[PDB]
Amino acid sequence: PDPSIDEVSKSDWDALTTQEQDDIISQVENLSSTGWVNTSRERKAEAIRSAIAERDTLYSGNMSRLPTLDGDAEYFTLYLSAHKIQLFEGGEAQSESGEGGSVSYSTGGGGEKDLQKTRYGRMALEYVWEDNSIAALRTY
């Protein structure tokens, strides 16, 4: 995308043209083979806007002068967006069944906290020190 998702804050996202937003939405839709096609644009826009806001407020600043967002900020915001979209769709599918057969997935009862609950969240979590507390500070 022309403005990349790591280059826009919440107010910038609101100021983008529809095409600049659609380029970013299109990029997020690449993170699932289904593209979440049955979920409307405004839900995908809400997920991305929320991921931008949550990056800038929960996954910003420093720990021992190291950035708290240590990985690529583009892919972190895209995975954080995909995590949100998947939760708006109701969560992971653990098992799916119908006329076309049945499949069961290695979701395996992932842990208590928000980002642990989906595959996209588990990817995003590696970009931010796995939510660990390595901050240190001194008196002078």
13 contacts: CB under 8 Å, gap ≥ 6: 21, 48, 49, 52
> What is the C-alpha separation between 88 and 8, in angstroms, rounded?
23
The size of the interface with its own copies (CB under 8 A), counted in residues, is 66
Per-residue binder mask for its own copies (CB under 8 A), 4-33, x = binder:
------x----------------x--xxxx
DSSP string, 5-58: GGG--HHHHHHS-HHHHHHHHHHHHTTSTTTTTTS-HHHHHHHHHHHHHHHHHH
Does the protein bind its own copies through residue 117 (CB under 8 A)? yes
Does the protein bind Mg ion through residue 70 (CB under 5 A)? yes
Does the protein bind its own copies through residue 139 (CB under 8 A)? no
Residue of 57, 62, 66, 135 that binds its own copies (CB under 8 A): 57
Per the annotation, does 70 bind a ligand? yes
Residue of 37, 64, 65, 98 that binds its own copies (CB under 8 A): 98
Residue (16 or 88) nearer to its own copies, CB: 88
The answer to whether residues 115 and 131 touch, using CB atoms and an 8 Å cutoff, is: yes
Residue ranges for the known binding site for Mg(2+) are 70, 126, 130-131
